[PDB]
Amino acid sequence: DATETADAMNREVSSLKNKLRRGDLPFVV
Amino acid sequence: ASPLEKALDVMVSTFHKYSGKEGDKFKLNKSELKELLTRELPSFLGTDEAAFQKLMSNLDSNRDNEVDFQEYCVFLSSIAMMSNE
Amino acid sequence: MASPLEKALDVMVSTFHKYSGKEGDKFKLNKSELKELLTRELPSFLGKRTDEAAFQKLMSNLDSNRDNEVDFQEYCVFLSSIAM
Ligand SMILES: [Ca+2]
Ligand SMILES: [Ca+2]
Ligand SMILES: [Ca+2]
Ligand SMILES: [Ca+2]
């Protein structure tokens, strides 16, 4: 969970989510 | 549903079972996190208050002193990543 | 005994390997393996249009280390992003 890696993973997930529905690109629903 | 779809559903339902007890119904406090880990992730538990407090801090990337669904998914990912290694 | 959540994590892992081990690097998904995993295991999350162009774009967005593969960490970022 090492803080550096949780924080990086959360940024990565937030980035991908934002692309999904704020929100470009749509192979995924 | 596929096994993976069923798995994601369990991840979601398990979070909401514990997050919805106190306070923000969509976030885990230290009490709720403790219950979830104790009852649902026993094979990964070493335990004391200090340990749960440290885990909470580590997971709390948005620095709001709770664990939200995203932070929880990142935590599960880290456990799975450990298991995959 | 393993909890439902512990078993769900096991399925996260096993489903990855089910596809990553088909071709090439046994521990990473190439574009074909990723398309198969999504098509076969995540139908409820698929859009109206599962054309090649949409998929190529998805691949690039998941491949954060730019090695033309989706590794286990990258796959977990994906699952975390779609879960709820
Ligand atoms: Ca709560
Ligand atoms: Ca938080
Ligand atoms: Ca492969
Ligand atoms: Ca990659």
Numbering used by the authors:
A (entry chain R): 1902 to 1930
B (entry chain C): 2 to 47, 50 to 88
C (entry chain D): 1 to 84
Provide passages from the article that reported this PDB entry.
S100A4 (also known as mts1, metastasin, calvasculin, p9Ka) has been strongly associated with increased metastasis properties in several animal models.
We also examined how the deletion of the C-terminal region affects Ca2+-binding by isothermal titration calorimetry and solved the crystal structure of Δ13 mutant in complex with the NMIIA interacting peptide. Therefore we solved the crystal structure of Ca2+-saturated Δ13 mutant in complex with MPT peptide, which apart from some differences observed, essentially confirmed the asymmetric binding mode of MPT observed in complexes of the full length protein and Δ8 C-terminal truncated mutant. These showed that WT and Δ13 S100A4 have similar affinity to fluorescein labelled MPT with subnanomolar Kd of 0.12±0.06 nM (SEM) and 0.28±0.11 nM (SEM), respectively. The Δ13 mutant also disassembled filaments of NMIIA fragment 1712Q-1960E with similar efficiency as the wild-type protein. Importantly, the Ca2+-binding affinity of the high affinity site is forty times higher in the Δ13 mutant than the affinity determined for the wild-type S100A4. With this high affinity, the C-terminally truncated S100A4 would remain constitutively active inside of the cells and this alone would impair its Ca2+-dependent regulatory functions.
